[PDB]
Design a binder for this molecule. Structure first.
Ligand SMILES: CO[C@@H]1O[C@H](CO)[C@@H](O[C@@H]2O[C@@H]3CO[C@](C)(C(=O)O)O[C@H]3[C@H](O)[C@@H]2NC(C)=O)[C@H](O)[C@H]1NC(C)=O
Length: 165
């Protein structure tokens, strides 16, 4: 039995998390970015990083962007998609809702969404949020429409890692 910080520490040892350069602060309280989620997904699901290729036109999406090799990987693999497919915008600083994360992780873990799920999630997400709660990826009382915190994604990543092992 481990606290959120202990789960982060365990996942850091496993190489799934690394925290931020120049601080021991895991910043568990703040909303995870789409870039951070791409990195965690690559580590969880053993995806190959794709260096030196840029599939998006976002300002400051280039070789200088640490997240590009992870964003490219989840893009090719189809675990994450463009925010704007036509303008080819990823929105790497953008946040991710609990229900968005639920669909991505449930799909990646090859779990089946729950038919006619009764919960507060958006219609497209109801089955995925329910399946995520049932598999111990998120708490039943999480707001599915709220931005997922780094704490929530540490908890989810720890469960996904244990179920994938
Ligand atoms: C210059 O911008 C900084 O660049 C850093 C890499 O050089 C970047 O570091 C990343 O931080 C991410 C935080 O979330 C996760 C999921 C984590 O493991 O905790 O992934 C981390 C990346 O691996 C990377 N961290 C390191 C030590 O290189 C900062 O986030 C990023 N900070 C911000 C505020 O965007």
């Amino acid at each position: 039995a481990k606290t959120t910080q202990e789960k982060f520490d365990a996942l850091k040892e496993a190489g799934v998390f690394s925290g931020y350069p120049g601080t021991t602060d895991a910043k568990l309280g703040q909303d995870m970015t789409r870039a951070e989620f791409a990195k965690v997904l690559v580590k969880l699901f053993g995806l190959k990083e794709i260096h030196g290729q840029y599939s998006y036109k976002d300002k400051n999406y280039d070789a200088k962007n640490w997240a590009a090799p992870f964003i490219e990987a989840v893009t090719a693999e189809g675990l994450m998609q463009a925010k704007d497919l036509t303008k080819k915008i990823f929105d790497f600083n953008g946040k991710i809702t609990v229900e968005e994360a639920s669909k991505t992780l449930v799909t990646a873990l090859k779990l089946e969404p729950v038919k006619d799920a009764q919960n507060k999630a958006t219609d497209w997400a109801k089955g995925y949020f329910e399946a995520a709660v049932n598999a111990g990826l998120f708490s039943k009382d999480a707001n599915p429409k709220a931005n997922a915190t780094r704490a929530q994604l540490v908890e989810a990543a720890f469960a996904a890692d244990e179920m994938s092992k």
